[PDB]
Amino acid sequence: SMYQLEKEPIVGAETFYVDGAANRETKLGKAGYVTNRGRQKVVTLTDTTNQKTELQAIYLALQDSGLEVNIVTDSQYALGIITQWIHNWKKRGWKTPVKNVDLVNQIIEQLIKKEKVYLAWVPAHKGIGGNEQVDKLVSAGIRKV
Ligand SMILES: CCOC(=O)c1cc(Br)c([N+](=O)[O-])o1
Ligand SMILES: [Mn+2]
Ligand SMILES: [Mn+2]
Ligand SMILES: [Zn+2]
Ligand SMILES: [Zn+2]
């Protein structure tokens, strides 16, 4: 393709647990990450949606990370649209998506600069791991948990 994502986590590389949450009534949201080297960031956003905040969190993880990065997301949309764009680049049956295309195309630019990326989906779940902590962080003031 235009790139290849890793098929299993990159051993040794820092992992970013990304998440975003938005509120449909106000279009307010937050995107951010926590990492397994004790890094964290949360941004507040306006005029956004849940899909945009999930994508924005991924963008931030690519922005702030080294050449090799492990990314854990709970958004099937974000993983799919990114993986589809890579797999179907400059190829026959491609028609780029309508929604979020500006955000997705900036993500793709961040991506090909990387050496190696592992991007995986896990369902939102409860507990104390990374997805749980970043969920609470992006959900604060946006959504009851
Ligand atoms: C605010 C609720 O917790 C989350 O951040 C969250 C839940 C779901 Br469900 C998704 N998603 O991308 O499928 O992200
Ligand atoms: Mn999420
Ligand atoms: Mn979540
Ligand atoms: Zn390397
Ligand atoms: Zn977890």
For domain 15-139, the CATH superfamily is Ribonuclease H-like superfamily/Ribonuclease H (3.30.420.10)
Question: What element of type H or E holds 23?
Answer: strand 15-23
Alpha helices in 9-99 (DSSP H): 50-63, 76-87
CB 53 within 8 A of CB 31: yes
Method: X-ray
Q: Find where tokens 């306006």 sit.
A: 46
Does ligand 1 lie within 6 Å of residue 132's CB atom? no
Ranges of each domain in the chain: 15-139
DSSP state of 65: S
- Judged by its nearest atom, the ligand closest to the C-alpha of residue 129 is 5
CB 107 within 8 A of CB 80: no
- Which token pair is 53? 């905040």
CB 109 within 8 A of CB 90: no
CA distance 123 to 62: 21
Bridge partners for 45 per DSSP:
29
**Residue with CA at minimum distance from ligand 1 atom 3:** 135
Q: Find where tokens 């295309």 sit.
A: 101
Query: What are the two backbone dihedrals, phi and then psi, of residue 86, each rounded to the nearest 5 degrees?
Result: -60, -50
Q: In a 3-state reduction of DSSP, which class is residue 85?
A: helix
**Residue with CA at minimum distance from ligand 1 atom 1:** 21
Does ligand 1 lie within 6 Å of residue 74's CB atom? yes
CA distance 140 to 130: 16
